[PDB]
Design a protein around this ligand. Structure first.
Ligand SMILES: [Mg+2]
Ligand SMILES: [Zn+2]
Ligand SMILES: [Zn+2]
Ligand SMILES: [Zn+2]
Lengths: 50, 186, 209, 533, 50, 298, 107, 123, 97, 149, 241
């Protein structure tokens, strides 16, 4: 089905709860995965969510 | 009707075809210029397209206003008639006509000089009419008769007709809305 | 031209004579391989050849069972046959006292003749073909499985085996090309031997109706 | 090949045809007993010299050759002057001085009804049919058959457009019923005078409407037609269900048969209709939803346009003869399908007309565009057609600058201000066919004339609830649209007072942890419909 | 079928004669292979192959 | 499989041309056995394939060729005493076509279904030209009939066998042996196979009704089996051969190709109540009663 | 080409009633006497000449030069070409090859 | 036979160009001429004669009413003079208007500002 | 009946009918389509071939030639209509041996 | 069509080589790869599209047709023939589509949905006629298959 | 009806055929194993072979063509004028209208349109006289019915079972009550001895309504009485999904 959109949502959400924020997933925009992963490693979690 | 036919495909002679056609259709009898067969060359039937009315012989080009007038001045300097159509209403107000805000018209003006025609480098044209400039361009080209005439009603019962000439070109005159906006911003 | 015409003549003669061989009439092996140059030797070029008479053939007989049973082949010349020509054929027939003859038309014939072809006589039967058909022998084509007509005894045996009544058999149309080729009337039965995709074989039967 | 026009005005809806069944042309209309060769209509029409008809159609040799056959039948028939032609088409009149005037009247007022004429100066209608024929003959040159799906040719109607016809019918019927009873009473019932106020039947209007709205059937004897299923019960499953419904579009085709046509997606929809949101199943493609940023126009005055157009040099049509049309340098000028004159140097006309619009003299929604294959300029003013706003670009620099956005954010000015100052303008499907649009600033080149305000506004209101839609495969987005409506959630702050046939709620809902900007525009997160797992 | 919200019917034959036919002829055990060409149709599906 | 058919693309023999019907529409086409179809295709062999002898011309002898370009120009000849039509011939161009046509053949081709103009009305002044003389037919006709005599170059009615056209590339990959073919888009098997210089005995058609009329039933039912199997396999679905053998037998056991439709089914079966349950419920019943038909229940 | 009468503007017709043919009107006595020849027709119409000489027709058109195939190059296909539609449009070339069990015919 | 083209002709003016000067004149009207085909109708009429509480008025829209209206107007006849006649040059003298070459026109006082909304009145 | 507010009942569509002719299960699709849906009993007079009532044929005024049967209701309904359209289905019956 | 054939050839080999390259770089034990190899779910084409490069969007077996006059979207110049102006998508789902690509992708996807909806009736009808004629035939003890009569 | 009426000699009610052909087709009918399809084909064959004849050999009686003159209206063409020599019979028929020609002038323009109209009464009293030996050649089995009964004069009202109380009542009921109502109208109306014209016009509407009872699809209904609403005739409840 190639719903990569769900795989990103699950990571942006995780990195968003931990620091009290809402992330945006707007069409043709939204939070880039290159920033979200560097947010997670700050909180002691692995930078790809596994 | 024949059925046994052996065709041929070997190369033939072009001048032979020309000679055959010559013999078939070039045996002219035009020497039969008898009275009832005479044709006045100025009375021919005519091609559909007016510009190419030369279907049998005895045996338009691009233009621009600056060109037209300057040939009408340099190459020729005789008189000519032109038909031009002006904007709905002119810059003037109705002169002491007592007016509904009626548009002024040439029918309501006096005689004499009324303005100047200005030709600019690169062939741009403007009609200097009072305080405003109106752009001018040639109109749709014509190929049919347009005769200018004067209708003299000499009496209530009868009058007189005289042809004055024919019209060869048309001109279109328009306000320059861009210029008016530039002068008075909105 | 006159070489394509002779080619057509050669081919149609080949086919007609092959057909007569297949119906089981007298024919000589040395004719079977009559080559186109052999035809040119026996018959000259088109302008010298009289179509309506050069190719007529009646030597064929039903030697298989009756050497005294003869038949005719005719090659009319006019594009459409008329009543007079078929009457000429039928009176020639009466002079030779024969019951069967073949007809070939280059293009066709009058509908009046078409109507007549059903009612010459019960004892006189005339079969019509078109030049553009016999120019190929349909029996030689790959999509046509081998048809073999069989006698009354064989059909008796067959429908005794399966307990059939003859009307329960599948049908072959009376006017079908192959049936008309073999010249089989109503009520005859034909065996078909289909070529299997493999070395095996399948048999089926059809009733002429 | 053939051509037809569904000539329609305020009074009646009609149509006409042409046919090429053998090579000559003929006019087909319902009230004419048999098709008439075109040249016969032209001679009856008031122009009889064949030379002039050929001038009307064209001068180029092959078009004239292909028209040729279409006048041999004429010269076979003993039909040489106008009067004979009116007699001929009089004999051919169909009915549900008859031989002379009645047939003239029908032609004058029943054929090509939408183009007008007053004093039997039918030159105008001659040109119109001459254009119409010139299309068919030239159309055989290349198989560029018209695509009826192109949205430049689609109009939309609303509550007002519909209610108007219904009320006008009822009001006319109210007068007519008051009429015939008024006629019946006074002459016979009583010598002393009566008064109508004793017969103001009140129930007739009220009933006429409410049963029409409730039943959704709009029978009208005026047009001998009926429209079904024009209203639906508002759906209240969830907040987004009602909001979604209030932007839906229906279609006239009504599932009559499979044609593999309008169900597909054509680029004409760009920015006007949502790509992702369509009903799944048998209705797929017949039902559509408006994009997020769109406008539907309304009727205009039409006055100052025709006046202004006449000033910009367009000549009157009837002052010139047929031979002019074939020249390669003259363009025609239309107005809502009507012919308005002839012009040369069109690009000046278009450029000035756009500029006057930007200055605010002509209404904002009036559109002007060019067709180069037919060399016609189409000016359009009728309402019901869609529009989008774009930022204007000149010489590779946008009109709007950070200062303006600062002003707007602080609050000095408002959207409408950007319109007078010629910073943004409304484009229309037929007009955005002409310009070049830039998608982002860094893609601007020498020629871009407009710039998108925000590309994410391409999607609709239901489809804007997906996060990261541009990372999924397309069918997935279409499925979510239809299931977002069925979710269970909140409805509105008065939901505890509603008594309604069926209502689903959720106990402890929550707002999304990953949210789109369309979610904030429609206030979705004030009425959420889910829970984070 | 796919367990995405599907539905299925069910009938209970009412005659001893109909029980015998349903079991002998229509049973799954007797129908492991499709009659179109004889290939198997009842076999392992995803997440058993992995 | 019929419902499973997805109507896949790139079925164009790898050449993106020859838009033959395929998929469920082709299946309907075969089952219905309607005597008229779209895009019929015939194939043939002659003797040998490639380079420099005896083959390619045959192509130009049966496929499409207007009169047209064989005249470089068509020009008027009016002259005070009379006028007539002229047609030029480009013999040199013909030779490059090497169609066997010449002036005399064109002469013979005219006078077929053309206003009964006699051979004396037509004249040939040279191998490069042909001319025809106008005549008044008096049936709404006069000397000016010239316009209705404008019936010579592209389209009125013509010599040759009509209903044929062209065909295009279809290459092969297996170079281990040399193998090629001639295709034809037409609707006359009898004629094409009957042409001189073609190995007729291996021609076929994809129109079942066409083959029946020309080679008997057995050729017909073999065509049906071939075409079903070719369609299914092309779309990648596998079916046993014993299912298609039985379908073809049932369709062709009564002596004719009976289509599986209302007309054919009425011709196959006999019960009135069975027919009434399928289609045409009104007429079958009323007609049954009139005939007093007694029906078993089997 | 077409003509209209200068006097009345209708189409001319061609007829003969005297020693010399004439271009005449049908409503007014204007006429022109044709003494010369005019050279442009209406391009008449007759359908596709396909099987004029179908099949292995006469051998007079044999020729020497021929092309060759890129793949196999077996000894039997000599050249031929054909035309499109009418007097004023181009002519086409096809290279068709045919032994058995294939589909070749190159454009 | 003549045919009318437009009702108002105000915005049309004839012109005569000359070296160093150009003279205008308002047009009184424009008309189109076509050959008259009434004679076939006359022939038809001759052949045919040889062979052998009122409802709401609608006469305003009927053609023969216009004919009757146009018949009220009497005919006037006119003496023709061709271009070959010197009378034509005699008449042509009237196109030139006398006066000083350089004159400041009293009219056309309106400035470009006034002219813009003058020709474009408020909607 | 068919509804869900009304008590329901599912359908053996024409596709299911054909699947059971796929298996050749002759007694199952007699049971499903007749025994469980609309079984019915009627009286037919063998002498005149058309149905009567209560073992008495009003057409013949006799009871010596009546015999009962079991036939689906919808087929009995069909015989009523046809006999009303003046197309009579005179049915002839015999012992079951 | 010569040009189209050449452009389609080039724009297909671009995706193939990008598809091969990613798969060779793809470490074993990767999940989509495990599913693809064992045949439980997916295929190699899916993996290439999710990572490397979405293909050439095609409608009815051809590049995107002209929808406006001489172009597919106003965002491109007249008479252009370059890849992007006719439906090519150089963006893998991981890196997201740009607005015009997303539109062409939706345009290509919709055909499948309409197709599936349409196919409901035609094949049902074919099956109804076909079975209604064939139902009686039954194999016998005599090995013949015989019609009802 | 039109098929059978095209066969019969209008003078003697016989089939028109040669005795040899009668014997031949009798023997054809005696062929065993007659099939429905063969019945149809034979009907076509006999119709084709019979239509050629125009004289009844049994009594020398001439017969003309039979053709539908109007919707549910039939006409025979015995008294037809021909381009060939005028038949004495048609001249005798033509010359007999002098009285009406004198009374009314519009008779003269259309005296050539006088043919034999077919009404239920005349067909019924014709069919009744067909002889027994002929029927099976007409392919309708004499055990199934007789032509005389093909034209109807009575109807059954179906039981209340096949038309429940609440449809208020079924449309078949409302149709039937209308038929009887209109029937009662005719009988009282004719007894009331009014002008002929209505008596027959009233009968045509009854004919159409009786037709409309069986089936409700007929498209030939003129404008000013076409049903404004759709209705369930018999075939509508047999046919349909
Ligand atoms: Mg599912
Ligand atoms: Zn004239
Ligand atoms: Zn009884
Ligand atoms: Zn008799």
């Amino acid at each position: 089905r190639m719903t990569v959109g769900k795989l990103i949502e699950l990571l942006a959400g995780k990195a968003g709860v931990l620091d009290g924020r809402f992330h945006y997933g707007t069409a043709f925009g939204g939070s880039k995965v290159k920033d979200v992963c560097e947010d997670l490693v700050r909180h002691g979690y692995n930078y790809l969510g596994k | 009707r024949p059925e046994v036919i052996q065709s041929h495909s070997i190369f033939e002679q072009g001048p032979a075809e020309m000679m055959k056609k010559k013999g078939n259709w070039d045996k002219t009898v035009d020497v039969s210029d008898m009275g009832p067969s005479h044709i006045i060359n100025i009375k021919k039937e005519k091609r559909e397209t007016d510009e190419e009315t030369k279907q049998i012989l005895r045996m338009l080009p691009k233009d621009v206003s600056v060109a037209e007038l300057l040939r009408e001045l340099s190459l020729t300097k005789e008189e000519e008639l032109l038909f031009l159509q002006l904007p709905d209403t002119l810059p003037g107000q109705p002169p002491t006509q007592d007016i509904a805000e009626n548009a002024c018209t040439l029918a309501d003006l006096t005689e004499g000089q009324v303005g100047k025609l200005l030709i600019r480098k690169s062939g741009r044209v403007q009609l200097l009419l009072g305080k405003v400039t109106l752009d001018v361009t040639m109109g749709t080209a014509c190929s049919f008769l347009q005769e200018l005439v004067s209708v003299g009603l000499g009496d209530s019962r009868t009058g007189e007709m005289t042809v004055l000439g024919h019209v060869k070109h048309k001109l279109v005159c328009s306000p320059d809305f861009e210029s008016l906006l530039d002068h008075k911003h909105r | 031209d006159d070489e394509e015409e002779t080619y057509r003549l050669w081919k149609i003669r080949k086919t007609i004579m092959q057909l007569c061989h297949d119906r089981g009439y007298l024919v000589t092996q040395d004719e079977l391989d009559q080559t186109l140059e052999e035809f040119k030797a026996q018959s000259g070029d088109k302008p010298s050849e009289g179509r309506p008479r050069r190719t007529d053939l009646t030597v064929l007989v039903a030697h298989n069972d009756d050497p005294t049973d003869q038949m005719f082949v005719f090659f009319p010349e006019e594009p459409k046959v008329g009543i007079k020509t078929i009457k000429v054929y039928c009176q020639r027939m009466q002079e030779e006292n024969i019951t069967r003859a073949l007809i070939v038309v280059q293009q066709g014939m009058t509908p009046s003749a078409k109507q007549s072809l059903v009612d010459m006589a019960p004892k006189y039967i005339l079969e019509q073909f078109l030049q553009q058909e016999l120019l190929i022998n349909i029996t030689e084509h790959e999509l046509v499985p081998e048809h073999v007509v069989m006698t009354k005894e064989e059909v008796t045996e067959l429908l005794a085996r399966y307990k059939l009544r003859e009307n329960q058999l599948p049908r072959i149309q009376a006017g079908d090309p192959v049936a008309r080729y073999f010249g089989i009337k109503r009520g005859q039965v034909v065996k078909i031997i289909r070529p299997s995709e493999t070395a095996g074989r399948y048999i089926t039967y059809r009733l002429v109706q | 090949v053939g051509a037809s026009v569904t000539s329609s005005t305020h009074e009646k809806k009609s149509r006409t045809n042409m046919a090429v069944k053998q090579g000559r042309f003929y006019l087909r209309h319902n009230t004419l007993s048999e098709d008439i060769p075109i040249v016969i209509i032209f001679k009856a029409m008031g122009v009889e010299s064949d030379q002039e008809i050929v001038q009307m159609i064209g001068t180029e040799e092959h078009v004239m050759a292909a028209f040729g056959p279409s006048l041999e039948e004429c010269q076979k028939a003993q039909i040489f002057t106008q009067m004979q032609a009116l007699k001929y088409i009089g004999n051919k009149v169909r009915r549900q001085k008859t031989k002379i005037e009645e047939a003239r009247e029908l032609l004058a007022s029943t054929i090509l009804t939408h183009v007008p004429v007053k004093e039997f100066n039918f030159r105008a209608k001659c040109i119109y049919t001459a254009v119409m024929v010139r299309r068919v003959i030239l159309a055989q040159g290349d198989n560029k058959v018209d695509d009826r799906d192109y949205y430049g040719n689609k109009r939309l109607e609303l509550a007002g457009q519909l209610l108007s016809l219904l009320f006008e019918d009822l009001f006319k019927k109210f007068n007519s019923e008051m009429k015939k009873i008024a006629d019946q009473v006074i002459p016979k019932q009583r010598a002393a005078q009566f008064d109508v106020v004793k017969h103001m039947r009140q129930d007739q209007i009220t009933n006429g409407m409410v049963n029409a709205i409730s039943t959704g059937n709009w029978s009208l004897k005026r047009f001998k037609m009926d429209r079904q299923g024009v209203t639906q019960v508002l759906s209240r499953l969830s907040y987004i269900s009602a909001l979604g419904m209030m932007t839906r579009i229906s279609s006239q085709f009504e599932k009559t048969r499979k044609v593999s046509g309008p169900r597909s997606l054509q680029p004409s929809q760009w920015g006007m209709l949502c790509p992702s949101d369509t009903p799944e199943g048998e209705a797929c493609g017949l039902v559509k939803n408006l994009a997020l940023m769109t406008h539907i126009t309304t009727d205009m005055e039409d006055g100052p346009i025709v006046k202004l157009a006449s000033n910009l040099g367009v000549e009157d049509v009837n002052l010139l003869c047929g031979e002019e049309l074939s020249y390669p340098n003259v363009f025609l000028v239309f107005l809502n399908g009507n012919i308005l004159g002839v012009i040369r140097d069109h690009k000046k006309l278009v450029n000035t007309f756009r500029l006057m619009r930007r200055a605010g003299y002509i209404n904002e929604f009036v559109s002007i565009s060019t067709n180069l294959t037919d060399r016609c300029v189409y000016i359009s003013s009728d309402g019901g057609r869609l529009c989008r706003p774009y930022i204007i670009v000149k010489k590779q620099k946008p009109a709007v600058t950070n200062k303006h956005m600062e002003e707007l954010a602080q609050g000095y000015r408002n959207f409408e201000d950007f319109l007078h100052e010629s910073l943004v303008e409304y484009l229309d499907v037929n007009e955005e066919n002409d310009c070049n649009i830039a998608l982002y600033e860094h893609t601007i080149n020498k020629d871009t004339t407009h710039l998108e305000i925000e590309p994410f506004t391409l999607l609709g209101v239901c489809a804007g609830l997906i996060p990261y839609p541009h990372h999924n495969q397309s069918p997935r987005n279409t499925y979510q649209c239809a299931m977002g409506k069925q979710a269970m959630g909140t409805i509105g702050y008065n939901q505890r007072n509603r008594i309604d046939t069926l209502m689903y709620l959720l106990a402890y809902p929550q707002k999304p942890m990953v949210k789109t900007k369309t979610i904030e525009l429609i206030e979705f997160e004030k009425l959420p419909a889910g829970q984070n797992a | 079928a796919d367990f995405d919200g599907d539905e299925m019917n069910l009938h209970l034959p009412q005659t001893e004669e109909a029980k015998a036919e349903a079991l002998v002829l229509m049973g799954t055990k007797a129908n492991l292979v499709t009659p179109r060409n004889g290939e198997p149709l009842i076999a392992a599906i995803q997440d058993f192959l992995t | 499989p019929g419902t499973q058919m997805t109507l896949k693309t790139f079925h164009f023999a790898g050449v993106a041309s020859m838009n033959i019907t395929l998929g469920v529409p082709r299946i309907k086409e075969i089952i219905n056995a309607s005597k008229a179809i779209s895009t019929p295709i015939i194939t043939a062999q002659l003797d040998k394939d490639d380079d420099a002898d005896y083959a390619r011309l045959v192509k130009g002898r049966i496929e499409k060729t207007l009169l047209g370009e064989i005249s470089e120009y068509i020009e008027e000849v009016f002259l005070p005493d009379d006028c007539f039509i002229l047609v030029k011939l480009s013999l040199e161009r013909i030779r490059l076509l090497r169609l066997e046509v010449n002036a005399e053949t064109v002469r013979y081709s005219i006078c077929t279904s053309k206003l009964r103009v006699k051979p004396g009305d037509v004249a040939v002044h040279g191998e490069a030209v042909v001319c025809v003389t106008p005549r008044e037919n008096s049936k709404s006709s006069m000397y000016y009939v010239l316009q209705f005599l404008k019936e010579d170059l592209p389209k009125v009615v013509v010599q040759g066998i009509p209903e044929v056209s062209r065909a295009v590339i279809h290459i092969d990959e297996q170079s281990g042996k040399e193998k090629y073919k001639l295709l034809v888009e037409g609707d006359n098997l009898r004629a094409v196979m009957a042409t001189h210089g073609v190995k007729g005995t291996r021609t076929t058609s994809n129109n079942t009704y066409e083959v029946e009329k020309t080679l008997g039933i057995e050729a017909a039912r073999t065509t049906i089996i071939n075409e079903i199997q070719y369609t299914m396999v092309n779309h990648g679905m596998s079916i046993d051969r014993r299912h298609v053998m039985l379908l073809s037998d049932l369709m062709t056991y009564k002596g004719e190709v009976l289509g599986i439709t209302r007309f054919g089914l009425a011709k196959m079966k006999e019960s009135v109540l069975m027919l009434a349950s399928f289609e045409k419920t009104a007429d079958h019943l009323f007609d049954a009663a009139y005939f007093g038909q007694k029906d078993s229940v089997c | 080409m077409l003509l209209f009468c200068p006097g009345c503007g209708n189409g001319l017709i061609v007829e003969e009633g005297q020693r010399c043919h004439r271009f005449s009107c049908n409503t007014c006595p204007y006429v022109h006497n044709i003494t010369r020849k005019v050279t442009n027709r209406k391009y008449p119409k007759l359908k596709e000449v396909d099987d004029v000489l179908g099949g292995a027709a006469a051998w007079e058109n044999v020729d020497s030069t021929a092309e060759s195939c890129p793949k196999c190059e077996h000894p039997r296909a000599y050249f031929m070409q054909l035309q499109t539609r009418s007097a004023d449009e181009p002519m086409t070339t096809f290279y068709k090859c045919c032994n058995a069990q294939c589909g070749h015919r190159w454009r | 036979c003549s045919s009318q083209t437009t009702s108002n002709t105000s915005r049309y003016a004839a012109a005569l160009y000359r070296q160093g000067e150009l003279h205008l004149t308002p047009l009184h009207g424009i008309l189109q001429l076509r050959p008259s085909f009434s004679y076939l109708d006359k022939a038809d009429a001759k052949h045919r004669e040889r062979e052998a509480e009122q409802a709401r008025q609608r006469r305003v829209q009927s053609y023969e009413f216009l004919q009757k209206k146009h018949a009220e107007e009497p005919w006037v006849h006119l003496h023709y003079y061709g271009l070959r006649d010197s009378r034509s040059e005699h008449e042509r003298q009237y196109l030139l208007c006398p006066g000083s070459s350089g004159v400041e026109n009293t009219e056309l006082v309106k400035s470009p500002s006034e002219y813009l909304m003058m020709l474009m009145p408020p909607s | 009946t068919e509804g869900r507010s009304r008590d329901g009942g599912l359908r053996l569509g024409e596709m299911e009918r054909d699947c059971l002719i796929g298996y050749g299960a002759s007694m199952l699709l007699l049971e499903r389509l007749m025994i469980s849906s609309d079984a019915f009993e009627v009286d037919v007079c063998g002498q005149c071939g058309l149905l009567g009532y209560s073992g008495w044929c009003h057409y013949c005024k006799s009871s010596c030639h009546v015999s009962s049967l079991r036939i689906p209701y919808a087929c009995k309904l069909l015989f009523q209509e046809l006999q009303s359209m003046n197309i009579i289905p005179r049915l002839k019956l015999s012992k079951y041996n | 069509e010569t040009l189209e054939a050449l452009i389609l050839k080039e724009l297909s080999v671009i995706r193939d080589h990008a598809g091969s390259a990613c798969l060779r770089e793809l470490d074993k034990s990767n999940s989509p790869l495990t599913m693809a190899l064992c045949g439980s779910k997916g295929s190699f084409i899916n993996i290439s599209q999710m990572i490397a490069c979405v293909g050439q969007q095609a409608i009815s077996g051809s590049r995107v047709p002209d929808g406006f006059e001489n172009r597919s979207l106003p965002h491109f110049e007249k008479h252009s023939k370059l890849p992007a102006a006719k439906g090519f998508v150089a963006n893998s789902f991981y890196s997201g589509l740009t607005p015009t690509e997303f539109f062409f992708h939706t345009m290509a996807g919709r055909e499948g949905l309409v197709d599936t909806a349409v196919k409901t009736a035609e094949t049902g009808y074919m099956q109804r006629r076909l079975v209604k004629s064939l139902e009686d035939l039954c194999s016998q003890y005599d090995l013949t298959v015989r019609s009802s009569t | 009806v039109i098929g059978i009426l095209q066969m019969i000699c209008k003078t003697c009610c016989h089939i028109m055929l040669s005795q040899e052909e009668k014997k031949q087709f009798l023997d054809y009918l005696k062929r065993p194993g007659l099939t429905y399809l063969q019945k149809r084909g034979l009907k076509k064959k006999i119709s084709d072979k019979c239509r050629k004849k125009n004289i009844c050999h049994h009594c020398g009686a001439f017969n003309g063509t039979v053709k539908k003159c109007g919707l549910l209206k039939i006409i025979h063409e015995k008294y037809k004028t021909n381009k060939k020599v005028v038949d004495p019979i048609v001249s005798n028929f033509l010359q007999s209208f002098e009285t009406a020609i004198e009374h009314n002038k519009e008779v003269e323009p259309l005296l050539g349109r006088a043919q034999e109209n077919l009404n239920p009464l005349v067909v019924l009293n014709l069919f009744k006289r067909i002889p027994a030996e002929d029927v099976p050649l007409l392919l309708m089995n004499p055990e199934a019915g007789k032509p005389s009964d093909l034209i109807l004069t009575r109807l059954l009202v179906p039981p209340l079972c096949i038309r429940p109380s609440v449809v208020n009542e079924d449309d078949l009921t409302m149709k039937l009550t209308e038929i009887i109502f209109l029937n009662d109208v005719i009988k009282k109306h004719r007894i009331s001895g009014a002008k002929t014209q209505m008596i027959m016009e009233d009968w045509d509407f009854l004919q159409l309504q009786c037709a409309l009872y069986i089936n409700s699809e007929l498209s030939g209904i003129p404008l000013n009485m076409a049903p404004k609403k759709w209705t369930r005739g018999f075939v509508q409840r047999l046919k349909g999904k």
